[PDB]
Design a protein around this ligand. Structure first.
Ligand SMILES: CC(=O)N[C@@H]1[C@@H](O)[C@H](O[C@@H]2O[C@H](CO)[C@@H](O[C@@H]3O[C@H](CO)[C@@H](O[C@@H]4O[C@H](CO)[C@@H](O[C@@H]5O[C@H](CO)[C@@H](O[C@@H]6O[C@H](CO)[C@@H](O)[C@H](O)[C@H]6NC(C)=O)[C@H](O)[C@H]5NC(C)=O)[C@H](O)[C@H]4NC(C)=O)[C@H](O)[C@H]3NC(C)=O)[C@H](O)[C@H]2NC(C)=O)[C@@H](CO)O[C@H]1O
Ligand code: NA
Length: 278
């Protein structure tokens, strides 16, 4: 899989980038999935569009989501409802109350209802709890993911999740949860960015990332940053080439394509080859 995201700020730039062709290759050739990060939990079992008035409020609406969806439908690209908990910083409390026994079914229902309402192709879960794991949070989050997975499966829809890239800390969800998440999802985006690479250390090396996904490495997407042309002692293109040669995917955060290296034909050609035809 090859995924990218549209954050809820600077949206005009991301929208322009969707239609770019860098001398013949661009996002329409490289992505299988596109994820507008436009929704948040309300904390009581429901969901909401982003509402911060200093974000791209002119785009937090159904018509703008359908622009993305219709763009992707031309190519067989899938638009994913991306729900996150970072509107005002990363707030795990919004997730913890959503995945409790009282609200969990309502939360799944609200997510799926919104995806169906807009004729989207699946859900990209981007709910982040830095240093927030506990036994209760692990259980409840995995019960949430299993229920969401079963519901989306019956609808023929895709499910992806973004996680922290390490396992040795107390993050949720992180690579210590991959063995339980892999059977439930179509893809996992490891949010390693400049901390993971060919030459990084241990679990954060790309070999270590793939090893932690050993149950189903074809479902792993290595997270790579649009604002850098290199990290961990390799070029952006080299990092993509490692994914190509080692049977994993790529997750590009994000569609602002801020560094010129991500505005080049070569890297989009490589992503197109990783993706394959749709
Ligand atoms: C201390 C301890 O006890 N243990 C240490 C342990 O914690 C360490 O583990 C590391 O912790 C850090 C900190 O928690 C982790 O860093 C976080 O990682 C996640 C996942 O990568 C990041 O979230 C995703 O990644 C991108 C890139 O950061 C996110 O994009 C950012 O999103 C924010 C919020 O929307 C954007 O901010 C907005 O920016 C606009 C424009 O500038 C501005 O107008 C807005 O006002 C502003 N809004 C807000 C609310 O701030 C920001 O621009 C954007 N960044 C970029 C580059 O585009 C994206 O949303 C997340 N989702 C997806 C999908 O990618 C998270 O952002 C990041 N937190 C911080 C503070 O940077 C780290 O992952 C983790 N590392 C590992 C390996 O586990 C370890 C290791 O260091 O050491 C222990 O000691
Ligand atoms: Na852990």
């Amino acid at each position: 899989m090859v995924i990218s995201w549209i954050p809820p700020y600077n949206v005009p730039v991301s929208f322009e980038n969707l239609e770019k062709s860098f001398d013949g290759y661009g996002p329409a050739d490289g992505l299988s999935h596109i994820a507008p990060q436009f929704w948040v939990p309300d904390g009581n079992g429901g969901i909401s569009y982003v509402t911060r008035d200093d974000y791209s409020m002119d785009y937090m609406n159904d018509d703008s989501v359908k622009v993305i969806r219709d763009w992707g439908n031309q190519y067989g690209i899938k638009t994913m409802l991306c729900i996150y908990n970072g509107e005002h910083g990363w707030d795990w409390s919004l997730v913890s109350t959503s995945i409790s026994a009282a609200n969990r079914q309502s939360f799944v229902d609200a997510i799926v209802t919104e995806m169906k309402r807009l004729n989207l192709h699946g859900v990209e879960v981007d709910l982040q709890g830095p240093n927030a794991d506990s036994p209760t949070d692990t259980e409840n989050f995995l019960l949430f993911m299993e229920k969401l997975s079963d519901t989306l499966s019956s609808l023929g829809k895709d499910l992806t999740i973004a996680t922290f890239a390490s396992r040795e800390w107390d993050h949720i969800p992180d690579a210590s949860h991959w063995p339980e998440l892999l059977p439930l999802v179509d893809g996992i985006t490891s949010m390693g960015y400049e901390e993971t690479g060919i030459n990084a250390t241990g679990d954060l090396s790309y070999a270590g990332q793939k090893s932690m996904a050993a149950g189903a490495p074809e479902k792993l997407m290595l997270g790579m940053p649009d604002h850098l042309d290199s990290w961990q002692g390799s070029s952006a293109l080299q990092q993509v080439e490692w994914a190509q040669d080692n049977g994993v995917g790529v997750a590009l955060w994000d569609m602002q394509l801020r560094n010129e290296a991500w505005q080049r034909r070569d890297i989009w050609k490589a992503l197109s080859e990783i993706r394959g035809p749709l």
